[PDB]
């Protein structure tokens, strides 16, 4: 499985289409604690990068998520930047306060699929290189900030 497969996967796709693009049985799991959804891992190993995919009752992909499929080009978020974000700010406002090169997407979803209102994006911004650095996390719904969190930023 890989990031490039994650980008191939599309909202609306069926379980079988996702499973096929993701790598099938070699790279992906379903059932047990995953339930009806799919988890694919890029390699074995502790904290291996992964993507997850969930489907509507009608069988269509409404949610994509991942951790560590991407790495910030320039880990550099400061608590300073974080202090100048607030719920209600637009996404462009967010990127004017926080350096986008310091962040990566950890998912996108349409909780109302097949209606598109309420689309949600999740961003993860590492303050430095390595496994579990200090970070900030931001979620936006329809282009507006609706969740903000930080751990251990200077």
């Amino acid at each position: 499985f890989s990031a490039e497969k994650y980008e191939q996967i599309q909202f609306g796709m069926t379980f079988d289409e996702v499973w096929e693009i993701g790598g099938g049985e070699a790279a992906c799991d379903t059932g047990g604690v995953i339930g009806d959804s799919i988890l694919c891992f890029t390699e074995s190993g502790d904290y291996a990068p992964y993507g997850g995919f969930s489907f509507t009752d009608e069988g269509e992909l409404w949610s994509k998520r991942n951790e560590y499929l991407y790495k910030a080009k320039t880990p550099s978020v400061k608590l300073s930047h974080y202090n100048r974000t607030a719920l209600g700010m637009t996404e462009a406002q967010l990127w004017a306060a926080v350096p986008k090169d310091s962040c990566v997407s950890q998912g996108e979803s349409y909780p109302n699929w097949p209606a598109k209102t309420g689309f949600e994006e999740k961003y993860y911004c590492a303050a430095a290189t390595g496994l579990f650095p200090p970070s900030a996390s931001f979620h936006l719904t329809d282009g507006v900030l609706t969740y903000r969190y930080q751990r251990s930023l200077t």
Binding site: V33, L39, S44, G45, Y47, R65, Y68, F132, Y149
Partner: protein
């Protein structure tokens, strides 16, 4: 040729390595190398965590069917299974499965909450004779691996002996020992380590861990003819190599102790 290889791996990583192989039945140590230096547990502690859980199950203080509802603020770095159950919750049994087989961080924290925290895990360990292993922090901070910090460390011999006791003693009931080792067998994210060099017919139940500052390790019960007969524990820390190089060094120790079984 294992101790050789273990020594080889040390200067190839430019980090401390520790190794022990223990006979599962007798408790006799077969070989070792720095068995008593301390190393970050990383995700290997998740198996001990879940033994403390089963122990409370055994004592009628916990139910594996108990459902725990948690929310967005409980989620930490690396939650592949728990992110998906914000709404419907997870049972204690599901939590142990996610922590051990997929190394889910949130799952591990949620479980640490059930037993009352890292100090309760240390007290549980202490009360069964392991006066060395200690958990001090939650995920993801327990993985920092500051040099010389003894927080959240074990020794290869303390972890090997404790795993032996959990997996075959009377420490847990038969149902609990079996669930504990079933969770480890379904390990899903340790293919490139010992499982890597294991031949058909072999049984393997293991748990791997990775932390910061190059820290890596594995604990495993394994053997021929679908039955575990030995415990192997390997830790390394300090190294600058690549993630795959260290990977390689550990497959290498297991290709060796597998060859020279």
């Amino acid at each position: 040729e294992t101790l050789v290889k273990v020594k080889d791996a040390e200067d190839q990583l430019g980090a401390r390595v520790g190794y022990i192989e223990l006979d599962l039945n007798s408790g006799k140590i077969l070989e070792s190398f720095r068995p008593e230096e301390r190393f970050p547990m990383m995700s290997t502690f998740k198996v001990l965590l879940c033994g403390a859980v089963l122990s409370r199950v055994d004592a009628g203080q916990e139910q594996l069917g108990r459902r725990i509802h948690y929310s967005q603020n409980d989620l930490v770095e690396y939650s592949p299974v728990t992110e998906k159950h914000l709404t419907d919750g997870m049972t204690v049994r599901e939590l142990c499965s996610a922590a051990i087989t997929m190394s889910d961080n949130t799952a591990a924290n949620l479980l640490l909450t059930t037993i009352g925290g890292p100090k309760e895990l240390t007290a549980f360990l202490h009360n069964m004779g392991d006066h060395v292993t200690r958990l001090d922090r939650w995920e993801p901070e327990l993985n920092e691996a500051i040099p010389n910090d003894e927080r959240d460390t074990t020794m290869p011999v303390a972890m090997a002996t404790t795993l032996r006791k959990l997996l075959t003693g009377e420490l847990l009931t038969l149902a609990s020992r079996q669930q504990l080792i079933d969770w480890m067998e379904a390990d899903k994210v340790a293919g490139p380590l010992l499982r890597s060099a294991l031949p058909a017919g072999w049984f393997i139940a293991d748990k791997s861990g990775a932390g910061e500052r190059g820290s890596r390790g594995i604990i495993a019960a394994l053997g021929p003819d679908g039955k575990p007969s030995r415990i192997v524990v390997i830790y390394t820390t300090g190294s600058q190599a690549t993630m795959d190089e260290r990977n390689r060094q550990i497959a290498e120790i297991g290709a060796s102790l597998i060859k020279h079984w």
